[PDB]
Each structure stands twice: as C-alpha cells, then as structure tokens.
Design a protein around this ligand. Sequence first.
Ligand code: SF4
Ligand SMILES: [Zn+2]
Ligand SMILES: [Zn+2]
Lengths: 431, 446, 351, 487
Amino acid sequence: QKYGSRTNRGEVVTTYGELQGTTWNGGSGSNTNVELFTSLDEPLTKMYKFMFQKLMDIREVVSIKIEELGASLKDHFQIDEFTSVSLPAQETVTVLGQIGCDSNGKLNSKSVILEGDREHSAGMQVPVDLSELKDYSLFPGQVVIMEGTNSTGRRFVPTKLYEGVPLPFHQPSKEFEECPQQMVITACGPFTTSDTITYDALKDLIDIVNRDRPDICILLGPFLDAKHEQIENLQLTVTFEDVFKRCLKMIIEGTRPSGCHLVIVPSLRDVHHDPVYPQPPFSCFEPAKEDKERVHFVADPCTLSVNGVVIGMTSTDLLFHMGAEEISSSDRFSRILRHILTQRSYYPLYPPNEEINIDYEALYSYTPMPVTPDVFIVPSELRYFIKDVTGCICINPGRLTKGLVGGTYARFLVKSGAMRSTCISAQVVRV
Amino acid sequence: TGDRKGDLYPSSLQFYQHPPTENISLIEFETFAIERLKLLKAVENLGVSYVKNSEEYSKKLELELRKLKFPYRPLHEEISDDVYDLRRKDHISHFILRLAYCQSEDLRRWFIQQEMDLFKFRFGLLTKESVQEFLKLNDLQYVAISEDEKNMHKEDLMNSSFGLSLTKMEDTEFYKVPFQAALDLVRPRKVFLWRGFAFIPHKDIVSIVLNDFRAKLSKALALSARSLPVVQSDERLQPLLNHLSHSYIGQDFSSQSNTGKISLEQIDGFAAKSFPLCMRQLHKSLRENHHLRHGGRMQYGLFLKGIGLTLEQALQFWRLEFTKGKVDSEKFDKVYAYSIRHNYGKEGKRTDYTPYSCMKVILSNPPSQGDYHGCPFRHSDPELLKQKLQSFKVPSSGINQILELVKGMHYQLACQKYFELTHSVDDCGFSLNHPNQYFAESQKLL
Amino acid sequence: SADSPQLPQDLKGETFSHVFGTNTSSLELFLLSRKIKGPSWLEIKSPQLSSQPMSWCKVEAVVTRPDQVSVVKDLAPPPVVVLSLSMKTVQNAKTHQNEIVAIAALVHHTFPLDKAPPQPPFQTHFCVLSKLNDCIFPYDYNEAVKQKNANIEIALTERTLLGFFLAKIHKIDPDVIVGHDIYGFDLEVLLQRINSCKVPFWSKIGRLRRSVMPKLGGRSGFAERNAACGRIICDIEISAKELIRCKSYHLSELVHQILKAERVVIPPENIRNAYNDSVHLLYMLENTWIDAKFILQIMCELNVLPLALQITNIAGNVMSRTLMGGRSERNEYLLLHAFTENNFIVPDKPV
Amino acid sequence: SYSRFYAKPLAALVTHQGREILLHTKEMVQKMNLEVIYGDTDSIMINTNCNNLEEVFKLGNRVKSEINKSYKLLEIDIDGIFKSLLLLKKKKYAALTVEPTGDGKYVTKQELKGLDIVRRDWCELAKQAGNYVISQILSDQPRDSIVENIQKKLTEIGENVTNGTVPITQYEINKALTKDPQDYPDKKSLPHVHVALWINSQGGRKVKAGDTISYVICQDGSNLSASQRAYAQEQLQKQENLSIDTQYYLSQQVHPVVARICEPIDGIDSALIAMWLGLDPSQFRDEENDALLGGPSQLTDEEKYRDCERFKFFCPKCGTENIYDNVFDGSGLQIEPGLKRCSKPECDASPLDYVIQVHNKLLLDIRRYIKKYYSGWLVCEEKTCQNRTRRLPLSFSRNGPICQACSKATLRSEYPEKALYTQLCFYRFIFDWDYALEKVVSEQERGHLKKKLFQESENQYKKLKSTVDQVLSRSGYSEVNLSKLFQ
Ligand code: SF4
Ligand SMILES: [Zn+2]
Ligand SMILES: [Zn+2]
C-alpha cells in the first residue's frame, strides 16, 4: 500500500561526476565483455566443503595474513627490522601486528591490544596505550605497523602509526580502447516489502532496466531474505527453493528485451543458500539456452572486469560491521572504505560480526583484493552515497526496499581510459 | 559393474600394494576398521586354539569371514557388484589397519602375523586356475608344469617331494620357480632342481608366495610409521587409530532392554557356576569382609546391572551387605548410595554405567594389595591361580591347559577353557570378550 | 688478508662448484686454529704495546700474528672480581620511561672458579641514591646516611648517579657482573638513561672503548647485543632456568626456593613515597642492598660460575655465550672442534 | 632449525626412534602390571601400586633393568617418588614428595604445582573450602576416607551457608579495577564494574583504575543476572531488602574451587559435589577407556545422539510443539511415523500435510546450527577461569590456544565440529525410514510398517532425509580423503 502510492519515483537522491540528461540509455550489452578479473589467484566458482575448521588452520591463516601484509608494507616503507611485540623495549622499536579488543564488547581506546604474528612474536599479545598517538583510526583485525616503546614490558605505547598502502590500480590493455561507455544498474536486496512476498520493487526495477537498457545489471542479495517476517514465522506455503527459483525466473525472463548482462551476487541472508563466507555462487538455477551468455552467477565477494574496468562488489554490509568497531582520534565512512582498500581484503574485520559465518581457508583464498577497483559496490543499511576514496568510486546504492517503503538503486557509466576518470558519472536514484 | 566400478579389483587375494585413492565417509572408515579388527582377532584366536591345517580352523575361519562379509571364496561368474563391494572393503580396511598397526614394533609384528595367516587360508581356498590367475596378475611368473614334462621327470619328482605316493603324485601338479625364490626349500634339499628351476608342489608354493608378501608388508609398515605425523593431526581418526589395538569388539550391555528378572536369592547360586572368576572373587570378598573398595564396587555392581539387577534391587543388595559391618543405613544413604544410582543412570563418563569388558578388566585398573578386582587370569600369580583352580576341583589336565594359555598372555582364552571345562562342553560356541556374555552363555546352558 | 673483500657465498666458476668458509668469523677461525677450548692460560710470544689505549683494562698487549698465542695447560684458574648489581627504578607516567633511582652493588675481589663459594659471598659494597626529579630528599638525608655508616653516595641527578656508577665499574673492573633480568631490563635501562641524560663514556660498562652504542635487540635478543663486552654478565634467571626447576623465575620465587627466605617487594607507588622520611628512603636502599645480596647468594648456591667454566671448557666456546643461554652457540663449538680435528669442512654459519 | 648443524632428516629419525622407545617402554611397564600415568621424551610417571617404599625401589630397579635390556645405552634414573598424587596435567598436580632418610624411613612434603588461581576475586569461603579439599587429598589416608571427609565438609559448608551462620566478611569478593569503570566494554556482565559505577554515582571518592572494589552478590527480587545484583557491603547492611545470594555463593564460588580438585577423583563428579553442597545436580550435568568399552564407533543411537537437540515443529493448526526424536512413535500395531498425527489428542491435523513447512523449519534449524558452529565461541577449560571469547589467539600451547585471561589453560570450542556433525547425523536419523525399520523397529512392528498405507509417508520421509543428506554432502567432517592419508 505505502510502496505503491509513493510520489518520489525516479528522484535522483545523489549525484557524482559529469552531468547527464534526465534520461539514461545504454547499449543493451551489445559491445560488452563481462568476465571475472583474471588475477594470479583462482576465483571461487563452485561449492567448497565447509563446517570443518581446525583451530590450527585458523591460526595459520590469520598469521599468514599478518605476515604477508607486513612484508609488503616493510618493502614499501623500507623498514629494517620488526621486533617481537611482547618483549620489553626501552628505545623506540617498530612492531607489526593486528589490532583487537581485550574483551568481548566493542573496541574502545582503553581496550586495544596488539597481537603479533608467529614469525616475529610467537603470536603473543600486548596491551596498547594510545595516549601518545595524536591521530589514529583502528578496527579489530587491522594489520598495522607501529613505532613505539614498551618500558614496563607490559604495555606498548605507540608513537607512530604507519599509514596504509593501497594496491595499485589496474592498467587496462588497449583491447577495449575503442569500446563505448558502459551503463551499469546496481541494486541490492531485500527486493520485496516486509509484509509481502510478491517482489513489487523487483518488478519496478526490471521495468526500469527494460526502459533504460543498461549494459550490466548487478543484483546483490538477499533474494529470499532470512529475516523476512513471513520466512521466520513459517507462513510460506512453498519451499524456499521454489520462491528463489520464481524470483530468478522473473529477473532473467523479464530482462530479455533489454539484453543486459545480469551479475547475481549471493548474500549471507539468502535463506536457501549455503551460510558460509566467502559465499559460493548460486547453482540451483539453469538459465535457458538463450540466457546462458547473459547471466553470471558470481561469488561473494566478486571482482568483475567490464571492458577493462575493474568493479569490486560484496553483498556483505561491511560498513555497518566495521562502523560498530572502528575507533578514531577525531568522514567516518571514508575512513572505513580506505581501511578496506588498504588492508587489501574484502573482509578485514576479525573477529567478524555476529551475522556472518567465515570459513577462514576460503577467506584466505578468495577475499584478497587483486587490485584497487575502479568502482566498489558496497550496499549498506547505512545511507546511500557515492564517495571518492583514494581514486576509487565507492557506491552504496542502499537497498531496493527499506522496510515498508521503497528504496533506491544506482546507475553509473564506466569507460576504460577515460580522461583517472574511469567513472564518468554515477547517480543514486529512487525506485 | 553398476555405477562407479572398474578393473581395480581383479582377483580376491591381493598383495595390498597400491593404496586406495577414494574419498570415503567417516562412518565407512570406522565400520571397515572395526570389521577387519574383528577378523584379525578371530584369526589370532583360532590360530592359538587350533592347528592352522586343522579342519576346525578352516570351518571357523570361513564362518567368521561369512559373518563379517569379507572375500574368501572365488566366483567363476564375473565381477558382480556385491563382490566388488566386498573386495573394496578388504582393500580399504587393510590400509586403515596399517595406519593403526605401525606405531610400535610389537604391533607391527602382530599385524604381520595375522595378515599372513589370513592370506595363507585364502590361498588354501584357491582353485588351480584361480591360483595361476593370481600368480600372473602380480607378475610372479611361476609356470605350472605340463603333464608331458611331469611324466618326463616322474621318478625325479617322486624322489624329490617327501612322502608322495605314486598314484597320489599322479594326482598332483607342480610349479616351476626360479631357485632364487625357493631358498628355504633348496637349502635342505627338499625340492628337485632342473636347469635353474625348482619343481614345487601345490603345498610348498604358498610358502614362497607368503615370503614375498611378508617382505612387502614389512617394508610398507616401515613406510607407514615414517608417515605418521601427517595423520596424528586429524583428530577424527586419532581416537580410533591410536587405540584400535585396545578396542572392544563384542556386544553392548549398557542398555538392558530385556535382561530378564533376577531375584537376589539367586545371586549366590549364580556364583557357583555362572559368574566368571573375576566376578566370583569379588562376590566372595563381599560375603567375607562385607565391603568392597571403589574398583571392586564399580566392577561388580556394573556386572550385576548387566545380569539384570534393577536399581532398587542393587540398592537393597549393597545396603544389606555393607550394613553387615562398619556401615549403618544413614551412611549407605550419604556416601555410597549415589554411586549405585550413577551406576544405574545414563550420565557420566561411559565408564560409570557401562558393564566392564574383559579388556577393560585386564588392561585397566590393576588391583593393588587388598584389592579384589581385576582379572584373576592376569593379575594373580600363576602358582596362586593354580592353587585356586585346584580348590575348584578342575581336572589336572585342564588346569595345565589353562596355565599354558595364561603363559601365552591369552587370558580370555584361558577363561574360555575354564568355562568349557566347568560346563563340560568341548566347544563353547562363542568367543569370550565380556563377563556378562559369560554369564548369559552359562544361563543358556543352564 | 681480512682487509680484502669477502667472496660471495654463491660464488661459482668454471673449474670450481662451491666456496666454503667465506663468512667464517675471525674469532671462530682463531679459536679453531689455535685449539683454544674455553677459558685457559695462554702464552703470547713477542708481545707489543698498543699505540693508544683500546680497552678500559689495566694492561694491554698486541700480537701481530695469531700463531703467537699458545695454550698453556694444567694450571689453576685465577680468582675473579664478581659484582652483584641491583637497581630500583620508577616508571614516569608522563615520559613513559624508567628512571634509575637507586643502585646497590656487592663486590668480591677474589672469587674462585674451581673452589667452593666464599662465605661471606662479598667483601665490599657501594650504593648510590638519587632524587626523582623534583622529589626532593627528606630534610636530614645526609645525617641519616652518615649515621648508617655505609658506602652510600647521594646524587643530585640521574646523570650524576650514572656517572658515579660508570666510574665505580671502571675502578672495580669486575670480571663478572651478576644480576636478575640484567640482560633484559638492567642493561637496556642503563643504556637508555645514559643516552638520555647524555652521560659520557658509556663503554665503561664494558671493557672495550666503543663510541657507538649497540643496535637494539631485534631478532637476536637482548643478550646478543654485547653491551658489556669483555665482562661476563650472569643473569640468574637464565642460569636458574637451566639448572633448577621452579614454579616461576621471578626473584622472590627463586629466593623462596633456593635460599628458603622471604623477599620484601616495595610497591611501585611506595618507592616515590619513600622520599618523605629518611627512614623510608633508607629502607628502600636496604631493600636494594638485600636484593643484590640475594642475587649473589643464589649465584653461589647454584654454583653458576664453576659450572659455566666447566661447560665452556667441555664445549670450547666463549664463556659469555655460555652464560647468555638461548640460541647462543654452546655445543656447536664442541662439534666444530671435533670436525676440525677430523679434517672436515664445517658448515657456514646461517645468515 | 636455527642450529648451525641443522639436519631435518637426522632430527626426524631421532624423534621417530624416541617415539618407538617410549611406546615400547609403555608396553613393558604395562606387562609388569604397573601403570604409566604420564610420558614425555623427558620423563615417565609410573603408578607402582605399592604401599611400601622398599618395594617401590625394587620395582624401579626392575623397570630400569627391563628398559636397559632392550636398549643398552639408555641409562635411566629415579628423579623422585610421590606417596599420593592428584594429577590433572603435567605441571598441574598436588603430591606428597618423598625424601628417603635411609633405612626404610622417609619424610613427606606437600608439593602443589600449577594450582594457583589467577583470578583473585574469590570469597574466603571458596578459598578455605579449596584449602581443606587439598589438605584432605594430601593426607596419607585411603581414598574412601578422603571422600567421606570431603563429603562431610561440603555438606557442613552448605548447611552453614543456608542457615546463615557464615560470617558476612567471608562473603566479600575483592576485585581490582584495571580501568575507569565506564571504559570496560563488558561492563554489563562485570559485577565489580557495576559496583564501581554505583560508587561513582553516589558522589564520594570516585573509584579510578587501580582501586579494589569489594562486593557481595545479594538477592533483591530483581530477576537480574548475578552481575547486576552486586552490592557493596554497607549497602547490604543498610537497605534491609538485601540478602546474600547463597545459591550464587555455592554454585559460582565454592563449587568451581572444589570441583577443580575433586572431579579428577574417580567416582566424584561436578553433580555429586553440587548435591553435597545442597544444589540441584541437574544444572551441573579418556579415549583409552572408551576404546576398552567399545570406542566412539560402536555407540548405540541413544548414546550417540544424547546431547543433540530434537526436532521441534509447531503444529500450524493447534500450535502445540511436537518433539521428534525417532522415525516411528508407539509400540506394536499402534506404531506409526511420527509425522502422521499431532501430539495433541484433540488435534486432528497431520504434520505430513504441512511437509513444506517441515522442510522450511528443517532448513532454518540447519542454518541455526551452522551459525552456532561458525560463531567460534571458545571457553577456557579451567573451572576457575571459564573465560568465554570469540577471538582465537595466535598464542598456542601443545594442546591448543592459550587462554589470554589466565595464560595457563587451553581454550576449547563451545560447539566443536563433532557437535555439528552429530546434530546433522541425528536430523538424518530422525528421518531414516530404512534404518529405523532394520534396527530400531521390532519384528511385528516392522511387518506392520512394511505394508501399504504408509508408502506416501515413506516417500515424504525420504524427501525430508534428502535435505539433511544434501547438507552433509557439503560437510568436510563427514569425508575422509584417503589420498591424503596414504601417499
Ligand atoms: S577373562 Fe574376562 S570373563 Fe574371564 S575372568 Fe578375566 S575378566 Fe572375567
Ligand atoms: Zn496439532
Ligand atoms: Zn583461562
């Protein structure tokens, strides 16, 4: 009722980049090449056996994460030697470690501990005293290098916190120099109103897709939300798989006129899918022979290459997860986004939030960020935004539905080699 | 060859050379391991009790192989799916037990012995055709002599094989082997050599085959012991492999279900003939000193539970007994009652409500001075044991047999022999691995 | 010659495949060449005189060729000067540093290495006390100190205290300095306060005249910094960990288990409150003196020094590395001597 | 590895030979009717089972001879003798060290290793109880006398507490404040932080870091966790609505301190100690022995799944909970599949009609259990610490992660992989028609169930089991890669 009678349909709630006309048109995915970013590491494309984590394996994965990031930072900063975190230090020493909270609550400036890696510290921890640090921004699981002293052997006092070093951007090949600008419409779940299971917002978005004919449509989960009031109280008369199959059929068949490449990203809130992160791609739907080349069932997180433009995307609410734990000396979202980019992982928070199941071997293998993406799609319960963080266009299109009321989606234009202005324009628009 | 089969298992017998490469389930792993442990323990017990060439040995081993569903007979039909399954079992189980039986030299020797015995039996059940097939598939390349050549060297063959009769010799076929493999036969000059080949009858060949097998197996066990650190990290398989050698392979008695009704008045009578010595001793002590120490208290009480005493019944039993000395009702209610209650409960460490098995009594909780629990066949001095048996008026010859078995550390078998004597049955028809089983069988014989 | 460059470890040529011994240390070459196995009496032929002093030692000599040093045999070890050192420090809540506020030292001038530990374990002793930077002394500190009739020196600053300590170490010239957590706490704090107060001649803590202070421990550790080069530093923590089992190796536990005594720990908040009364300050200084006495007594009771001498002689290494513990080379030298005596090319030291 | 002479092959060979020697020594000692109660490359702890010191020395000489026979160059020495030993871990025991004075007479000295409690917020009641328990264990009396004395003292303490004869000073708990009270992330669960916040709110001397807060847990009629019901002693004496929470002081103060020393005794468990103290045992309820009694692979279904949650399904019609723990319910010809009739006699609804809802609830339950497993909750195994954390520290001992609260005990998973595997196996079990027919069901019942009128139920049960089978097919705990084992 409330959604159907909305009056702000099509309103542009946020804008960035070159001004464009009131109407956006795309190439219908004609001269479009969508693939997974070809990096050294193989992508997650199939289910991996889970529910069996050895504490030793978790220890090894965390330790190697710290060690690898510290090695890269040491080469970049020309640091001579790292020192064990636990040992006393009367003079200033450089220490590599990861941040954490001394208790189970939320991190605060008086509850910070630094845990070293196995190579340099035997995994030992030390309390941290942030009284002598003038500026800082710390979240649990953050790999840091600090110059400080430990006079009592019991409390590390940092004096310098080395800044993060983001990965270099992608240097596109000339193969896509002559390709036109590409239009991407991105939306995130939930796709149905809190009190309905009819997917009205999804129908409106599909109508928008057919109207504007974008080159890529990135749909992020959930598609059958686990927190939907109907799902939790067991009022559904059909199986979860059937509802999800109906939703996917609606999406794929309804986009036939647009000829738009669909990129489907699962969510941890998908009640019908495996609850593990990194999430494998959906595998319960077989597109018809006429839609096989258009539909891309990708994994969470995903690094996509679109005519040379690298788009990073994750369904996980990274900003909400890290905002609850980040502590700063004095834009918060920009700080968190820079933290994500500099840590070079799509989920650097450790321990994770209570709402995400992390398989740490798969996390090690499939969460490293190959490069710094040209566009980074990070849907969040927080407010929509389009930010420029260290040259990367971070887009939060919100969620298509916000409770009983309609939500928002985003549309942006990407061209490889433009001007670094790989993102010509971007807009958060209302549904 | 239904769905996912192949030529991986041509013949029944194998040298177990190539490790399995499949992905099996944990349940399948455990089932196969335990089943082959049962098979090997049966082989060991039958070897101790009977002569390996005896017909009783063959009959009992065939019965065990049929019961546990292991390949023991050939089939001139084809590779039927069921047959394939059985062979797969055998192949995987063997290697699992290798992982179980490579940690200690003792264990290694035991494993090797049992395996050799089993292999010998299976070879003994192979028809000549099948035998040749086997000898070919493993590149042993031993040639079966022709009839014409046999007649050509008839007299030489007759004088070569010890105790071979003319007609009986005509009924036998020999094999040609390089003399480097028949060292143990040639060295004492018990097989004819012609042009570098020994002519080995159908009886000696198994020996050579076994020699080869043993060599290989020993090497394999060494390698396995060298590759142990990779397996210890797998907690799932650690409780099993590290303790398989000490795994009880009998039936369960924790759940009484239908154990019958036993009146306290019967208990004394049972101690005459139905209680195994381990329990009988405890009963005697309880009726003499009117008290048992923790060990005994547990052992005996759990045994009673196994034979069907109900919680109330046990409370009465123990109550009266302790009350007949240095204990009053209040004391039994404050200190001891809880013990019995837990013995009859289903919460604890599984050693509190589970009747103890023979192995639990023999290899755990050795009695000290003044403690009357444990296995008498193990924890009592041999001479003392002899005296006890004399007190029971068991025939001297039987006593000797029992003592011999005890000297071989075959305690359970000793107990079995005692049973067979007391009930006057030549064959008991069961393998003793639990005192409660003992009791039940006694009652079945009444 | 050692002044010529050093060949690469991975050096290879058309005629030769590998090169061994490129990074062999001079000390290792000397010890293995002259067959010097641990402390011993050495004879030097044709000794020379140094142009300028190179050490803080009474006598100096120079030998041009290593072949001039020979091992005398069968003679008894000489006595050594042993100094047991304790110090009271206070953490500065503002500067986050430990300020040395008192030092106590017990000195035995003739300590045996092959006989039984002396009774008493010390002959002389000195103490130095300082004010905590605007924590003025009690009114009558001087009169109380004089009445105590002890060798107590009052320093008006940490700088003067450190200068006095270095002067005393130079004059006494201990062969062995024994402390608890001396490698990990005492030496590091001493060096930091010397370079913070700008005290000259830090090298008087050692025996060689050094201008640049050693690099921080890093991976090697606090012990492998050689702050007091030429002096054998005995940390009873490491020696106890090697020679006796205890629930913990803090000084109080060692006192309880080895000496069967009770050790009084002045709380940190009480050390700075001891500057209200002369009695309290004297109690703090006596606590430091008692701690030095306890360290020396534990050293004597465990017979750390004779055992270190015997271990060094058996292995054939440097005694300082024997008493350092940890990853220091002790038995590697036994194997090195055996292999060199049996015509072997010993492996190159890992780098 | 840092050694100048590092030779991985040589070290591996030496370690392998040491393993062989250790196992052979265990076998020898066992054959001698003795027990090796601990073994490491550095030491062997053997149970002589003798009450005479002379026989102990004889057995030691005999063991040395038996070892030397198989290994001539292995020279062993006796490092000590204990008259009594309560052992929880190497470096965690209480014992009566024996120093022999010659001529068959010896002196005993108490030796406690690793029994100190890192936490100092313990009431004097618990400290005295623990001291008495250790005194009883380290007496030369037999086991039965020790247990009787312990029971006597625990019942006495419980009765004294419940009778209000305990001095109030012995209920006081002192805890140090290591921060400003407002700066504790877990302030809600911390009682001393609660009391510090109250003290600061009152308006007196504010309590900063380094201050010791003294508090007593009191019952005030609030239905709030014990942490919130923490009051200063003066407040308890003044309010007149405050009473000491005796149940807390017996369950959370005395019971841990006593069970950490008494649970190791065979025949005494936490439930028994709770019963002796006067509490409700319901709230408190070795691989070698398991193998000796059957092993983990030969357990009955009831024992295999006794800690697993049963399948709860609310009837859509009546809304009454239905608990499913087996495929079939009832006995004899009255036996039918559980999902055929509702548990409420007045309800005619058949859960088999709402099989879509049953499927959805099954998937939701599987998600719940997977989430529980991946939460990664760890609890300290030490009773006196019981630290609960989500963070896995990289500092590991030989047994696993080292608890960062006490630095002396191992962190164990609250919901290990075996728990989740057994839960999924149980959910498969409660839908396994064929297995139930073969094993669980009797003969006449099997005949009655192996006819028509149940084929539709059989098909629905097969479909429901397919879900749990699909989930288990994606579990790494249920698969053994034989390629990794045999190479
Ligand atoms: S062998 Fe078993 S049944 Fe026989 S006396 Fe020993 S424990 Fe009892
Ligand atoms: Zn109902
Ligand atoms: Zn702990």
